[PDB]
Amino acid sequence: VNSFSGYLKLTDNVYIKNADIVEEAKKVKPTVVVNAANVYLKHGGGVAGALNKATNNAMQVESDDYIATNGPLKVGGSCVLSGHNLAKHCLHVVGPNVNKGEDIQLLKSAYENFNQHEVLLAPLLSAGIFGADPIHSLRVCVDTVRTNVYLAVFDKNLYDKLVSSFLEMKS
Numbered sequence: 001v002n003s004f005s006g007y008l009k010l011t012d013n014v015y016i017k018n019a020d021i022v023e024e025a026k027k028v029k030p031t032v033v034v035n036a037a038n039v040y041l042k043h044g045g046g047v048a049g050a051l052n053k054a055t056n057n058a059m060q061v062e063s064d065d066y067i068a069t070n071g072p073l074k075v076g077g078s079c080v081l082s083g084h085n086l087a088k089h090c091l092h093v094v095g096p097n098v099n100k101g102e103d104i105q106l107l108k109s110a111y112e113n114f115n116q117h118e119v120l121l122a123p124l125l126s127a128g129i130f131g132a133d134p135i136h137s138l139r140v141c142v143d144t145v146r147t148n149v150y151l152a153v154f155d156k157n158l159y160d161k162l163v164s165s166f167l168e169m170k171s
């Protein structure tokens with residue numbers, strides 16, 4: 001388990017790889033894969049849709065059952081459900097939807113949930129459908145997370161941009 005390979009070490013606890021999070025999860029077998037979730041755990045597109053699709057929709061059914069007895073998550077909040085065939089556990093974390101004016105400071109709260117887990121395979125929270133700048137999401141991850149986070153960025157051009165601007169800013 002947690003056999004991560006081919007990552008660029010950004011800090012003592014943050015790693016980044018140009019990879020699709022589903023394919024990484026199948027290779028690595030992480031204890032925790034992170035979902036970029038929304039408060040009702042409707043796994044439509046992006047990471048959530050890809051993770052759910054790779055579980056043959058088991059993640060959505062599990063999530064419906066969770067919501068039915070617990071109600072929606074809060075923005076910046078999280079829950080631990082099954083990792084299905086992809087991981088031991090999936091940490092569903094709700095970043096703020098910046099497009100709808102949700103407070104971008106909640107991205108800090110979202111990444112704080114990573115600190116409850118020794119090691120995680122994760123995407124850049126809020127950087128896709130939710131409209132936060134990916135460079136900002138990476139910065140918040142680096143400053144907030146103290147546990148071992150392995151970031152999967154599937155798009156090569158975004159990966160190159162993220163690494164370049166991480167170096168520039170780091171000084």
Ligand SMILES: CCOP(=O)(O)OP(=O)(O)OC[C@H]1O[C@@H](n2cnc3c(N)ncnc32)[C@H](O)[C@@H]1O
Pocket residue numbers: 019020021022036037038045046047048050095123124125126127128129130131132134152153154155
């Ligand atoms: C409703 C929640 O909205 P939120 O913005 O929080 O999450 P998202 O829309 O899933 O995007 C989060 C970030 O992961 C990237 N991304 C998308 N698919 C994959 C994938 N298969 N593997 C690795 N990275 C991926 C996406 O391009 C964006 O950089």
